[PDB]
From a paper:
EM grids of wild-type [name] contained a mixture of particle sizes, with the majority appearing to comprise barrel-shaped multimers displaying seven-fold (heptameric) symmetry. The final [name] maps for the full size wild-type [name] complex extended to approximately 3.5 Å resolution. The structure of the full-length [name] assemblage was built and refined into that density using homology models of the NTD and [name]+ ATPase domains generated using AlphaFold combined with the crystal structure of the C-terminal domain described above. Ultimately the maps supported modeling 14 independently placed [name] subunits arranged into a dimer of heptameric rings. In the resulting structure, each heptameric ring assembles via contacts between the NTD and central ATPase domains of adjacent monomers. Two such heptamers further associate with one another via tail-to-tail contacts between their CTDs. A large internal void in the interior of the protein chamber contains no significant electron density. The buried surface area between adjacent protein subunits around each heptameric ring (as calculated using the PISA webserver) is approximately 1100 Å2 and involves up to six directional side chain hydrogen bonds and salt bridges distributed between eleven residues within each interface. The buried surface area between each pair of CTDs around the equator of the assemblage (producing the tail-to-tail dimerization of two heptameric rings) is smaller (∼600 Å2). The structural rearrangements observed when comparing unbound, DNA-free heptameric BrxLWT assemblages to DNA-bound BrxLE280Q hexameric assemblages involve (1) a hinged motion centered around a peptide linker (residues 469 to 497) connecting the [name]+ ATPase domain and the CTD, and (2) a pivot of the two CTD domains, relative to one another, in each ‘tail-to-tail’ subunit interface around the [name] equator.
Residue numbers in the entry:
A (entry chain I): 273 to 485, 491 to 677
B (entry chain G): 545 to 677
């Protein structure tokens, strides 16, 4: 058969305990070794599942592949999916959704697909684009297969424009990034590079594609915070910093910085400040015995930010102390290596971004005091101003 | 009495079901620095009734300043700076302020103002919501 589709995958059960790695190998290489001989197959595997809960509930409480059986909840096994079709956005079948017009023959369709199986169009993306730096080689393979398949359905004649490959590439990136988020959720740290992007070959613009899916009510895990900053295009934007701390030797890793030099130098200055002022801030905890990895995730698609030293230092202090930053916290402003604070750009705009439903308390720097009158009274009264003076006081206000 | 009347009037907007008519309140004023009688006490009284009726503990080491009218109009804090040094000497960590006292922020020394976590309530109901945390 050309396609095998496991219906109601929640009910799949295999008598042979060795089968799981057999499927792992079959999806990994297209061939499986049984006994002493290796058999190849061209059958495509589909997994059909029923979703019982709401999308938001499943996203917040679990991973979207929750209906999969416990025995099949594995990182490597889920890594082999070429796509995830989120059927919840597809409406339930209605007769008005059923056409009454002309259409090609189903047998004829299956035919044309079967002969199209012999051909390939995964190289078309190479003509107009390059893939971003946040996708591994498995991601490369998956996106190439998906774009080739969409090209096979829509453009069998081989004549195509750049807009077509844009649409196919972005669709593939979105469907694979959904899987990337699911694997990150189920596996913890190993799937952190989830920020899918593609660089245009001519314009050098890196377009970031995010899936369709400021603060949750409740105190977050230490090492997590939110900030608002003025991006390279000048619009205020919200970003989330996520710090992972492990027992190490003072090493620093960064991700989600849009591969921006400015963000890297700012966080490096912040790391230097934290190491220099570790004793007073941590009360004795040694930075030299812990490795920190900071991640930036952008929720508003506003663009990369340059000013990131102060929130990164706050995340460092929170993670090293293991005590949660205050709930609904928004950290504003930047800092110098000498501890001098810079006034927050776009006070009104930043507070408006913070006004987005959920956030209540904001730490403002002292230099922004002269900018208080520029704030409308109604907006200013809705927020608790944890007015700090220096980055040490900023950290203390952020941790309460 | 004005604070109690306002508390009766706005029970729904503050408590969400806790009925004033079914409960009796006893308010007791304690002087700790021998400073003398005070006049402006309506807004702190309202905060007290709201906290007691709801059983919600007030935020630790916060100081509520300002007074209110019967209709809910808030009055600016007279001599906010001296009250701030008093709070700093008293061990206070948070301050509750109305909008009108924000115009008095520039007259406040920056060092003292940096020591308190202001919430900047606007409405007396908003004053309750800020106080309850």
């Amino acid at each position: 058969w050309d396609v095998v589709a496991f219906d109601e995958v929640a009910g799949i059960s295999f008598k042979d305990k060795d089968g799981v790695q057999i499927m792992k190998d079959y999806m990994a290489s297209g061939s499986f070794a049984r006994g002493r001989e290796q058999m190849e197959a061209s059958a495509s595997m589909v997994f059909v599942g029923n979703i019982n809960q709401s999308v938001e509930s499943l996203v917040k409480t679990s991973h979207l592949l929750a209906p999969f059986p416990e025995a099949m909840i594995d990182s490597a096994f889920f890594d082999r999916f070429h796509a995830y079709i989120p059927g919840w956005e597809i409406p339930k079948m209605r007769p008005e959704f059923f056409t009454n017009r002309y259409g090609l023959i189903v047998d004829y369709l299956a035919e044309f697909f079967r002969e199209m199986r012999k051909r390939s169009f995964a190289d078309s993306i190479e003509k107009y684009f390059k893939l971003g730096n946040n996708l591994n080689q498995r991601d490369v393979i998956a996106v190439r297969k998906t774009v080739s398949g969409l090209m096979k359905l829509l453009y069998p004649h081989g004549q195509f424009n750049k807009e077509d490959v844009r649409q196919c590439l972005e669709y593939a990136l979105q469907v694979r990034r959904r899987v990337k988020e699911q694997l990150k959720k189920i596996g913890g740290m190993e799937f952190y590079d989830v920020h899918f992007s593609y660089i245009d070959n001519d314009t050098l613009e890196e377009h970031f594609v995010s899936v369709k899916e400021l603060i949750p009510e409740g105190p977050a895990k230490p090492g997590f915070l939110y900030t608002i900053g003025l991006s390279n295009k000048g619009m205020p934007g919200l970003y989330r910093l996520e710090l992972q701390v492990t027992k190490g030797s003072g090493k620093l890793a960064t991700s989600g910085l849009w591969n921006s030099s400015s963000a890297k130098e700012q966080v490096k200055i912040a790391f230097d400040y934290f190491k220099a002022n570790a004793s007073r801030i941590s009360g004795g905890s040694k930075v030299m015995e812990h490795d920190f990895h900071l991640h930036v995730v952008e929720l508003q698609n506003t663009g990369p930010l340059s000013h990131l030293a102060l929130p990164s230092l706050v995340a460092f202090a929170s993670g090293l102390l293991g005590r949660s930053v205050q709930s609904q916290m928004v950290v504003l402003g930047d800092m110098s290596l000498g501890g001098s604070v810079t006034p927050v750009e776009s006070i009104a705009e930043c507070l408006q971004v913070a006004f987005d439903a959920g956030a209540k308390k904001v730490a403002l720097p002292m230099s922004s005091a002269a900018d208080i009158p520029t704030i409308p009274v109604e907006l200013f009264t809705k927020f608790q101003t944890s007015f700090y003076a220096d980055p040490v006081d900023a950290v203390f206000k952020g941790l309460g």
